Design a binder for this molecule. Structure first.
Ligand SMILES: O=c1cc(O)n([C@@H]2O[C@H](COP(=O)(O)O)[C@@H](O)[C@H]2O)c(=O)[nH]1
Ligand SMILES: O=c1cc(O)n([C@@H]2O[C@H](COP(=O)(O)O)[C@@H](O)[C@H]2O)c(=O)[nH]1
Lengths: 213, 214
C-alpha cells in the first residue's frame, strides 16, 4: 500500500457536514482516511462511498471486528460492498475469526488490518499479554497489514520485529493520547491522528504542523 | 433485572429489512426480546432499531461487541442508545476503562450494558478463554449486572454463573447451529440466544415453537 505523508486521518466526528468539511481541509496532506463506527453509525454506511467519490481517498473501515467467524464474514462483506478499501479486525477472538475476514478480503480484492495491541491504559489488562502471540498468529496466516500502539514505542518496536520489514504497520495514539508521531514512525509506516486534527481550530494548520515536526 | 419472554432471544442476523422484519414478526408471539447486530445494522441502517421497537414492541439488544478505546466506546454507545437500543453488548477484553466508558453512557441515558466474557466459537480458546474468569470478575467489581457467556461450553457457563452470582442476568449464544443445547444452557443462563436455527428455518415460527417445546 502507498500512503501520502505517513499520516492517516482518524475521522471520528459524528455529523456528515463537519466530517466532510474537515477532511476536505486536510485533503492536500492525506490520501488515506480511517473511518470508524462513530461516523458510520451516525450517518450511515453510504458515507464511505461519499468520502471516496468526493476526495478520491483510500478508506480504512475501523470496525475492530471481534465476532464469531460467521458474523465476521457478514460484517466484512457489508463493509467491502460499501466501498471500504480495508477493514481493521481484532486478533483476540482467535485465528478462525481472523481467517473469516481474510477470506472475504480475498474474495473481494480488499485488505485486512490486524489489530495486535491497543493504545489505551486498559490495554495492559488482557491485550498486552496476548499481543505478541496475536501478531505471530497474523504473520503465520499471511496477514500483511497491522495496527499497533503509538503510546508504547517499545511495544511498537517488538511488533515490528515480529512482523518484519515487508509488512505494513499503522499506529494510533499519537497526539491526544500522548504519542509522538516522529517517534512512532521509527517503527510504524504511518501514524494515525484524530482529535489533534479534527478538534483543532484550524485542522489544516494542525496537519501542517504534524507534518513539519 | 429485565424480563424476557420464554427465556429465548432471537439473534436477527438476516441482512435485508424485508426478511428480517417478516421473520421477526412471525416468531413474535414467542419472543419480546430481539438481538440485532452489525450484519443487519450495517446493511439497512441504524434506523432499523426503532423500526423493530415500533413494529413489534420488543426490547432490542444491540450486539455491537464494543471493543475500542474509552473515548470511542462512549461515542458508539451514545449513537446506539440515541437510535433506541435498550442495551448494548460490550467486550471485556479491552479492559476496565473501556467497559466503564460504556457504563457511563448507559447510566446517563438510562439503558443497559451487557458484558461479553467468553465467546462460543473455537478460536475463543486461544486468548479469550484464559481471560474469561478475570473479565467476569472485573465486571462484577464494576457493578455490571448483565453478562453474555457461551452455550457451547456448559462447564465454562457454570463457572461464569458462580462468579456473577444468582442476581446477575446471563444470556448465552451458541445454541442450535453452533451445537449448544437450549435446555442445558438454561441450567446456568437466564436466556438462550438463537439465530440460524430459527431465521434459516423453512418455518421460523415452527422452529421457535419446537425450541420452546424442548
Ligand atoms: O489501539 C487503538 C486502536 C484504534 O483503532 N484506535 C482508534 O484510533 C483513533 C485515535 O484517535 P485520536 O488521535 O483522537 O486519539 C480512534 O478513532 C480510535 O478509536 C485507538 O485510538 N487505539
Ligand atoms: O460468544 C459469542 C457472542 C455472540 O454475541 N455471538 C452471536 O450470537 C449469534 C449466534 O447466532 P447463531 O444461533 O446463528 O449461531 C450471532 O448473532 C453472533 O454474532 C455468538 O454466536 N457467540
Amino acid at each position: 500500500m502507498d500512503v501520502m505523508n505517513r499520516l492517516i486521518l482518524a475521522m471520528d466526528l459524528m455529523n456528515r457536514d463537519d466530517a466532510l468539511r474537515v477532511t476536505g481541509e486536510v485533503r492536500e496532506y492525506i490520501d488515506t482516511v480511517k473511518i470508524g463506527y462513530p461516523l458510520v453509525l451516525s450517518e450511515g454506511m453510504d458515507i464511505i462511498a461519499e468520502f471516496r467519490k468526493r476526495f478520491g481517498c483510500r478508506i480504512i473501515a475501523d470496525f475492530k471486528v471481534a465476532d464469531i467467524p460467521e458474523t465476521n464474514e457478514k460484517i466484512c462483506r457489508a463493509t467491502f460492498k460499501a466501498g471500504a478499501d480495508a477493514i481493521i479486525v481484532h486478533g483476540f477472538p482467535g485465528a478462525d475469526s481472523v481467517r473469516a475476514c481474510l477470506n472475504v478480503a480475498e474474495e473481494m480484492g480488499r485488505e485486512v488490518f490486524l489489530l495486535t495491541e491497543m493504545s489505551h491504559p486498559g490495554a495492559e489488562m488482557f491485550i498486552q499479554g496476548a499481543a505478541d502471540e496475536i501478531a505471530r498468529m497474523g504473520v503465520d496466516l499471511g496477514v500483511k497489514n497491522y495496527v499497533g500502539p503509538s503510546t508504547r514505542p517499545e511495544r511498537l518496536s517488538r511488533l515490528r520485529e515480529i512482523i518484519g520489514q515487508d509488512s505494513f504497520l499503522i499506529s494510533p495514539g499519537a497526539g491526544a493520547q500522548g504519542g509522538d508521531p516522529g517517534e512512532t514512525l521509527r517503527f510504524a509506516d504511518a501514524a494515525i491522528v484524530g482529535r489533534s486534527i479534527y478538534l483543532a481550530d484550524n485542522p489544516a494548520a494542525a496537519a501542517a504542523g504534524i507534518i513539519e515536526s
